[PDB]
Write a protein that binds this DNA or RNA. Sequence first.
RNA 1: AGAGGAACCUAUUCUCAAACUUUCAAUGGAUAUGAAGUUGCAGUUUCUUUAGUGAACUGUCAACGUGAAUGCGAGGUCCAAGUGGGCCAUUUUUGGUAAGCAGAACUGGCGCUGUGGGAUGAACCAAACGUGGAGUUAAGGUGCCUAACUUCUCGCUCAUGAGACCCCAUAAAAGGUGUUGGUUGAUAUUGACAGCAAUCAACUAGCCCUGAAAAUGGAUGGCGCUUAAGCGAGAGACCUAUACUCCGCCGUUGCGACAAGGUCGUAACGAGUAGGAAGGUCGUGGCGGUUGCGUUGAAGGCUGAGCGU
RNA 2: AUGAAAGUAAAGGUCAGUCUCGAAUUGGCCGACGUGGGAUCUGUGUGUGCAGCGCACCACGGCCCUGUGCGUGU
RNA 3: GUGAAAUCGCUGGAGUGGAACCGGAGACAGUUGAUUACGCCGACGGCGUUGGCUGCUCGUUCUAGCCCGACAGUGUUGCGUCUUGCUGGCGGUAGUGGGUUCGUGGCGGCUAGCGUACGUCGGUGUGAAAGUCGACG
RNA 4: GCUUACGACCAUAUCACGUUGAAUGCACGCCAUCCCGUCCGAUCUGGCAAGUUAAGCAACGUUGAGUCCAGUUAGUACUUGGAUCGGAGACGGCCUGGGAAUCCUGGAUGUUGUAAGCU
Lengths: 52, 187, 179, 160, 61
Amino acid sequence: AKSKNHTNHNQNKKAHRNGITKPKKHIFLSMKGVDAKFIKNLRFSRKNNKRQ
Amino acid sequence: GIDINHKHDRVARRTAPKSENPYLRLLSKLYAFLARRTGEKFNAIVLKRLRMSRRNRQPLSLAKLARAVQKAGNENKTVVTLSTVTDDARLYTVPKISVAALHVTEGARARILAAGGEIITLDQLALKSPKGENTVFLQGPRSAREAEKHFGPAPGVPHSHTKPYVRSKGRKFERARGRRASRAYKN
Amino acid sequence: PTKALGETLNEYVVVGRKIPTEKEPVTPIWKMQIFATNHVIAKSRFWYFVSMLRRVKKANGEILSIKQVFEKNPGTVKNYGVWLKYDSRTGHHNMYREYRDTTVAGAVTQCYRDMGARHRAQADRIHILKVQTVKAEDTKRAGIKMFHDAKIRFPLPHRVTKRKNLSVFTTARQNTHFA
Amino acid sequence: TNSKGLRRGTRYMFARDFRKHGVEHLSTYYTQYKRGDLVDIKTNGAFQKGMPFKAYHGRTGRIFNVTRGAVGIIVNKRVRGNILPKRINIRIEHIKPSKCRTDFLNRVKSNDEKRKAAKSAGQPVPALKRLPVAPRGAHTVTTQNNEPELLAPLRFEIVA
Amino acid sequence: KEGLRLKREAEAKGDFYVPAEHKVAFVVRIRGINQLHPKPRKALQILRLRQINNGVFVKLN
RNA sequence: AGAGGAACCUAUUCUCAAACUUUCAAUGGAUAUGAAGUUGCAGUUUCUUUAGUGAACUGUCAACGUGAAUGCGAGGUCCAAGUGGGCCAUUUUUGGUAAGCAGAACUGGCGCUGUGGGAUGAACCAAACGUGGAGUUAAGGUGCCUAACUUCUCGCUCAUGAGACCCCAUAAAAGGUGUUGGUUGAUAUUGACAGCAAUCAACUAGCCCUGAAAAUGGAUGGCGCUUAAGCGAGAGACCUAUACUCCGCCGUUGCGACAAGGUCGUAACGAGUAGGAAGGUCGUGGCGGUUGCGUUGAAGGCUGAGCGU
RNA sequence: AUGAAAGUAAAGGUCAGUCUCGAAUUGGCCGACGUGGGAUCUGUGUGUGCAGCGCACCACGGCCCUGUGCGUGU
RNA sequence: GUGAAAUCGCUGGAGUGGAACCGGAGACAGUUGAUUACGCCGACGGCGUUGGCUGCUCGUUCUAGCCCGACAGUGUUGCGUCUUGCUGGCGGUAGUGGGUUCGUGGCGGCUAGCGUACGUCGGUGUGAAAGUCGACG
RNA sequence: GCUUACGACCAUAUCACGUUGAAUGCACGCCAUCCCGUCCGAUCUGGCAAGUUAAGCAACGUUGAGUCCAGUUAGUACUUGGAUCGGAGACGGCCUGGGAAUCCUGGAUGUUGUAAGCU
């Protein structure tokens, strides 16, 4: 009664049934994971620019 | 045989309010007529929100109405909302507001009328602005529900701020393992 | 696989050439005589042979012209010699065969049918190297040579005639001898 | 089942090219990388720090971070029915500028320049659209000194 | 008329007038909708040939 | 394995590698292809530089105006079922002598699925399904079973049970002076072989024959078929699907018209196990109300005329 | 709301100053933050464009409360 | 009280070759309906729609043959660089002139299903009843 | 046409043998008090200019080895998709598209940047 039986048979069909969803377009806007020193200077730069 | 997919042939929609409220059904009838004949997207929006469920019509605040009317050009426009207008205790001054709404609470109604405002129903709006002229469409915050706080990535997932379903709140209720680095880990 | 479909294969003259490039502003023009059912098959076979012989394929080449060839005088009888190369189930062989016909296309069609009959060879395994008209004295096959006689004569010994548009049963007596 | 170490099956992927071992030339370090640029990932075996995972070898990514000697890259990776934009910190030695984006930027520059020149000079707006190669047009071929050569299939010869 | 004239003129002096390659085509689907590979299946769908004996015009290039 | 200067050196040579490689495809993978863009002007920074030097950001800044093909409306959230024994096939592939064996890769199927054909068959070939009709076909076929030709053309084959159509329902090494074609080398009219006018030899490959033995009586599906009703190349026509075209009706979906929890119009569409939803003037028994019938015959029971998919 | 707890507990934007030029201070105005996208609404050209106010919601940020590490002083 | 189904006996009808039942399509038996115009049915014409089979006729493409001329050859008649035939390419096409290809071509003939721009007509039914007609079966 | 310092690509630049080398320069070179380092002033370090192109280095030469490029190999090997394709099978061809690599043959033997200088 062997019961390991790995396979990848019906997996691409399942993956494609609802389409392969590509990543969104706003993912490049976030400044997450960027250098802390650069981020600090960006905060300082943004906190001081006069509006008018 | 033809190679097409029928999975999304049918689109779930509301062709009439689920409510048995006869007045709500009559309002839906009237605005279905208006939307079909005038051909105005404003009338279509009013129709859809009339047929919507009460979950999607969250209460609006008198403060939000006041902010809407205090904007340059909105002084004499009619505020149209299909959400309940509630009174705000934190609002100190109420301007002159002309509001067409389904339901306005007693406190909000009293304050609006005291400040020289006017409250009309949707049937009266149909006569005042059949095409929706000089209107300011508003609604309450749809995502501001306690249930919504529990929606999203699972609580035990990295960078997840979803509220868990806990029996009570305290140090003995899901605060030990997987929530602090002292016990195994923290996500 | 390619098949010699159709009564009386047609004959085409196909002229093509490799598409000129910068390094070769002028390219040689090749011409072939093809026997096929129609001109689409003629073009495909032309490219088959030209790609076998020269380093060019249909992608880099073009067809300057393709024109059907009709027998000049179909009112005269000729002896045709056919040089062909074919594949058996075991090896490759060259054959020379002879036919008598009024048209070279008819002779080549006869060749294809005969190869199928006597060697179970299909059109995809046969290459017609050459076809020509041979003189009566230059033929070398007994079946053809036996008809190069001005006094040829023979009867029709055992003639079985088929009734065409009348009942299956008859009281008539059937005769197979007609003197 | 296979083992799941980082460098399983990379015997040739992470190896140097024939007669290309040794000291890494310095243009690799002189190249300029800015956030938003597209880079190809090709692991250099000679540098064992900041090595990309084998799954990302040969993929293109967009830079989102620029540190002292490395860059953060957003690389698409297919996981079942979704494509995940994974973020990886790769050193400069395993990175190379991608020419696909630069070609497009050059074409955009040319389009803008051509449009500006035409408008300034009063010419009609030009066609600035790539078009698929159309079928060949009509032409005449001359046989002078190029007479057609009659070809025939060749007989079978026993090439022992 | 012009195509024939050019062809005959080239033939007279022994040249070859090559007409322009065809620019439009008609495509008819002749096989059923079962047991099809993903790539030809999507290609037929993109060409709008989702049934037997469906025909479309295609710009050749 | 020799060669040139027993080993050794030099230049070669025969045959090779899942855990060898200079070189290296086809299929394959990835990214980009404009408005969320391009040019400037004019500000911010505590970062960076010797430095407006850069990097980045900001502005109700100014101008420019959509930059491959084809197709097509797109995106978001929530709640939850069943499943978590699979099997088959072309191709690739590991163990095994093999297996209707065990294990993998891509894709398509059966499972969940009927329909025409393969005599029969889960998977093979064709093709997927509302309910009817006319026409045309796919694969397969047309001597009779059996709808459709003992239809037309050329060959080959005689077998003391020949052969006869994907999967497929076994056949080999080796042979034949059976017959039919071809290849090569010879001799021959200064008359070739046999006996006191073509011939000889060696090969080759079509069909046929030998190799070819099993147990209830038995299988090209059967009968039978021999210038075939067999084998190969072909031609006309013809037959036949739940497929294709057109016509009617039912419903679903999308869209639309109408002062309506409704009607109507229009286009496309309709497979289904486990499972999920919807509609039910489908059915059953109470309660609060409402509408009526009944000893001139209720419930129950037996069973003709109808209605509804 | 947050911390194990003692406990503490959610108002800034902009403009102008003084300055011991700083991890300072003062005063007005506004008051639930900024930007981008936003059905609808408003104005104005010519089905379409431009401009303005922007709901819900999304994206990117900014501040405020609490715990904690570093780190100061007034 | 009512008095179901299974099972069983009788009378009449009908079937009955190693199962019986069942779906589709008719026939029979049987059941049932039936007010000049109108119902229930049929036939022949017209029109619409989808067709099936089958002829002429113009033209288009690519091409000849017949016919003429010389040359080369020969499965050759009659009586030898003979003649008559016949073949091959090559060069001519005036005239004559068929194959092949198909046309955003022109003119026909026969005929089917479905529906009714609609016509010409018949069967039946207006008390019963019988018969007839129609539908189911 | 060159030399030097710092390079970029990293053999068309390497390797072997040989010829030539104007001027700057590079180099070899002389000395070892001092700084500095060694068993050793050989290397490293410091102070110099008598001498030499001998070597390094540069240019050039070689039917030179290597490297690089091209032709051929060859539309071959291999390969995508198709067939109620041939064959007992192993396998084979055809249709539809992609398409190599050795042997062998021919050619090339560094290109170029900043700074300073010679001619």
